[PDB]
Amino acid sequence: GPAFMFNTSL
Amino acid sequence: TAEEERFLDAAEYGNIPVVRKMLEESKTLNVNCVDYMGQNALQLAVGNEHLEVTELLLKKENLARIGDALLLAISKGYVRIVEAILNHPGFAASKRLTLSPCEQELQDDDFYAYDEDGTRFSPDITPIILAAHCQKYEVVHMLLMKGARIERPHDYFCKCGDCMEKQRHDSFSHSRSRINAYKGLASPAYLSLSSEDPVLTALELSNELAKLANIEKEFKNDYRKLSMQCKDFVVGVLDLCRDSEEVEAILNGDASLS
Amino acid sequence: EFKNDYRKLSMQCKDFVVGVLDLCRDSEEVEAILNGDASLSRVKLAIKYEVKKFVAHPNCQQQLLTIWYENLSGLREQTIAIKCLVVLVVALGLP
Amino acid sequence: QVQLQESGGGSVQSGGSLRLSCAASGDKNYYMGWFRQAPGKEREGVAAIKSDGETRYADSSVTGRFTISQDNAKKTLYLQMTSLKPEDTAMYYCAADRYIGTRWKYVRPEDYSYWGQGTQVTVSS
Amino acid sequence: QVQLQESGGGSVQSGGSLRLSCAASGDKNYYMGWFRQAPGKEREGVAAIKSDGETRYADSSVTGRFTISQDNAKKTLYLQMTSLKPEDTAMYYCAADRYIGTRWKYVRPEDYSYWGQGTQVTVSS
Amino acid sequence: FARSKLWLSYFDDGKTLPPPFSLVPQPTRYQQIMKRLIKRYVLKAQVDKENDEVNEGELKEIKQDISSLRYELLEDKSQATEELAILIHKL
Amino acid sequence: QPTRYQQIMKRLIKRYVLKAQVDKENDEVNEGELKEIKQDISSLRYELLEDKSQATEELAILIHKL
Ligand SMILES: [Ca+2]
Ligand SMILES: [Ca+2]
Ligand SMILES: [Ca+2]
Ligand SMILES: [Zn+2]
């Protein structure tokens, strides 16, 4: 979705 | 009834012990009872930011105003309430977040209705558009993770079937619908989190909104305001550069000062 | 002596009807605010009562433009020079 | 101290109709209501009416079938009970109070200071 | 009331592989998950998956070695267990619920209303 | 506003030709719309009020909420002590 | 995997999002924001008072056994 992932599901 | 008067006050003022007790033992209670403004328990709890009451209400099936409570929560930026509502099978199981405002206005399921007739916001305003309008960066990210996108409103002189029949039908809902879509596209919350190159996207969108200001003379101020939003977003990104490499990326794009 | 008190209250009624007009979202709602219960009864009253922001509001203006260009859908989006061009065309052929 | 005495109770077959009367003796009874207490349970509200006539009914089971009313001038409180059910069998009290507050619209027994003796209503199916 | 029945459990040697199946009977099971209860301890989460397929796994010991999945259309819940360890010996339950909320991402047993009978998994080293 | 007055002069059918060439001879639907807009206005007005700056009096109201809450809780804590104090007498 | 320009863009956008959130937190507090805190105390009061009542009922039934 988002272009950038700044954070793999936690 | 007294049970509904007591229940509505408990939800509105966050009386969690009473809300939980009534949702458990009471068999004569209508969770969809409304107050003097036609707001049920869910809308009263969301408005006052009662997350614990909100989750108790959503466990109760046949609860109404699910779609409006999400929009109300998004408008106030209650991130914890939003993810509680977005975890209601009305949203989780279906594809309401993914579908466009036009596709939304074809379902006619009155999901985002706040009362017998009408919606709290304009019917063309989807959850993602509303989150972009309010500039809720975390809410936009949550909706983007679900697949929600803003559909571009097409060109003004578009001769497709949709743009022809919508202009013929109302021509005022259509004009306001495209402003709302562009008001979400031009938001820094959606500009930064949607495209891989927000600076390029904002520059191109700024020109597109500037041209529409001339075409739509009556809504010229609305489009000029949105153009300035894209104009000072790229200035804001340029202001954050701290070394030459970052500046050379913003100015030259991917030394031709493109 | 209490002119400022009454002028302040008049503006409160002036921007209430502008506020209600600002909330209209489709043509039917606008046609209810402007035409009352297409005779623009409330638009004429607002002009008569000098409620300028009501008449100048984009919701009212878009309704006036539609009546202004009744059968001139093409001429609505034409440039100013073309509109001035058709004035001369009308002027030359007016008889 | 206002004096409340209940009358009209008795034994009725299911689906029948009953009318309870409450004679009030005193002036500070601006708030009156009817309360039932089924055996083995706690006293719960049924209806409550102000002096101006604003009423609220406890739950939605009694709404539409129970009607509370007051001569007001004649100092009498009435409870019109229609479509009686076996679960309606209880001891019915009328209570009065000079003031209740924001909690009046809940019909809660603890908000009423003066109570009658109560009349037994037994609905048989 | 959704009916959950577990299958696939048994005795496996350490480091082995197991696959647990959960047959669901009902429609309001938008949230399902797997829970284990080792003897002498409390029931704890293992994994949880939504209808759209968003999953979360309890702890990091089961991450990468346990995989939860659901036919969804065919109303079946699966737990692929690989690299079994002796501490994985427990009783495994599948639970379902119509709604969880902000606490879904914690995989907490108290948030699930419908439970299966549970199948015993005994990993021997 | 002035331009609209110019437009309204031409909406009537009487002013057709230029002066030189003019010589030759249960609730109704409106009530439903009004109810929607007024409710839309009341809710919008309440949202706009909630966007106003918070005053000292509004903050003092919250300060008194903590003041009232403190007295209720401390007395409630004292109720636990007295209940346990009399519990020792029986034991 | 990402190009160098993508790495720079990700840094600046995250730098923008955090800077925008800091600037929002510098805006004036409205009445609605304060009402949210007033309801936090309202909800907290009901939870605590009921919790205090739970202590009383537990001790009330403790006397019956004793
Ligand atoms: Ca203020
Ligand atoms: Ca603010
Ligand atoms: Ca809260
Ligand atoms: Zn089109």
- Whole-angstrom Cα distance, residue F8 to residue C60? 12
- Whole-angstrom Cα distance, residue F43 to residue B76? 14
**What is the distance in A from the centroid of ligand 3 to the CA of B233?**
33
Chain A residue with minimum CA distance to E105: A10
Contact between E124 and E104 under an 8 Å Cβ cutoff? The reply is no
Contacts of C30 in chain B (CB under 8 A): 172
- Whole-angstrom Cα distance, residue B2 to residue A6? 50
User: What are the E-state strand segments in E11-75?
Assistant: 11-13, 17-25, 31-37, 44-49, 55-57, 66-70
Residue listed under structure tokens 């059918």: F13
Distance of CA B234 to the CA centre of its chain: 23
Instruction: Kindly give the pairing relationship between strand D119-124 and strand D11-13.
Output: parallel
Q: Where are the alpha helices (DSSP H) in chain B?
A: 2-12, 16-25, 41-47, 51-59, 66-76, 79-85, 89-92, 101-107, 127-134, 137-145, 161-169, 173-185, 188-194, 198-215, 220-239, 244-252
Distance of CA B112 to the CA centre of its chain: 11
Q: Which technique was used to obtain these atomic coordinates?
A: cryo-EM
C-alpha distance from C80 to closest chain F C-alpha (Å): 16
Mutation for A interface: B86, B150, B193, B201, most A CBs within 10 A: B193
Question: At B52, is the secondary structure helix, strand, or coil?
Answer: helix
From the CB coordinates, do chains F and E have 3 or more pairs under 8 Å?
A: no
Tell me the sheet residues that pair with E77: E22, E70
- Give resolution in angstroms: 2.7
Rg (chain B; Cα; Å): 21
Per-residue DSSP letter, B119: B
Contact between B93 and B122 under an 8 Å Cβ cutoff? The reply is no
Tokens read off for C55: 């008449």
Other Cβ atoms less than 10 A from the Cβ of C79: the count is 8
Tell me the sheet residues that pair with B113: B119
**What is the distance in A from the centroid of ligand 4 to the CA of B152?**
10
Region of B136 on the Ramachandran plot (φ > 0 left; ψ -120 to 50 alpha; else beta): beta
From the CB coordinates, do chains B and C have 3 or more pairs under 8 Å?
A: yes
G28 marked as part of a ligand binding site? yes
**What is the distance in A from the centroid of ligand 1 to the CA of B77?**
21
For residues B20-47, one letter each, b for 16 or more C-beta atoms within 10 angstroms of the residue's C-beta and e for the rest, the string is bebbeeeeebbbebbbeeebbbbbbbbb
Chain B residue with minimum CA distance to C66: B171
Region of D83 on the Ramachandran plot (φ > 0 left; ψ -120 to 50 alpha; else beta): left
C-alpha distance from F12 to closest chain C C-alpha (Å): 10
Q: Does A10 touch chain B (CB under 8 A)?
A: no
Ligand nearest to the CA of G25: 2
- Whole-angstrom Cα distance, residue B192 to residue B189? 6
**What is the distance in A from the centroid of ligand 4 to the CA of E7?**
54
Question: At B35, is the secondary structure helix, strand, or coil?
Answer: coil
Dihedral Cα B204, B206, B210, B212, nearest 10 deg: 70
Contacts of F54 in chain G (CB under 8 A): 29-31, 33-34
Give CB contacts under 8 A, 24+ apart, made by F53-62.
F53/G28, F53/G29, F53/G30, F53/G31, F54/G29, F54/G30, F54/G31, F54/G33, F54/G34, F58/G31, F58/G34, F59/G34, F61/G38, F62/G34, F62/G37, F62/G38, F62/G41
Tokens read off for B2: 């007294």
B49 marked as part of a ligand binding site? yes
Nearest CA to B98 among B125, B70, B59, B126?
B126
CA distances from B75 to B44, F38, G21 (A): 14, 20, 16
Residue F54 phi, psi dihedral angles, 5° rounding = -80, 135
Ligand nearest to the CA of B77: 2
Distance of CA B83 to the CA centre of its chain: 14
- Whole-angstrom Cα distance, residue D85 to residue D12? 10
Contacts of F91 in chain G (CB under 8 A): 66
**What is the distance in A from the centroid of ligand 3 to the CA of G47?**
12
- Whole-angstrom Cα distance, residue B116 to residue B110? 9
Residue B129 phi, psi dihedral angles, 5° rounding = -65, -40
CA angle C83, C89, C94 (to 5 degrees): 120
- Whole-angstrom Cα distance, residue D4 to residue D51? 16
- Whole-angstrom Cα distance, residue D32 to residue D22? 10
Please provide the DSSP assignment of D13-58 as one string: ETT-EEEEEEEEESS--SEEEEEEE-TTS--EEEEEE-SS--EEES
Give residues preceding each break in chain A, C–N over 2.5 A.
Answer: 7
Contacts of B51 in chain E (CB under 8 A): 102
Contact between B232 and B191 under an 8 Å Cβ cutoff? The reply is no
Q: Does E101 touch chain B (CB under 8 A)?
A: yes
Mutation for F interface: C20, C42, C66, most F CBs within 10 A: C20
Give me the residue from B123, B170, B218 closest to C58, CB to CB: B218
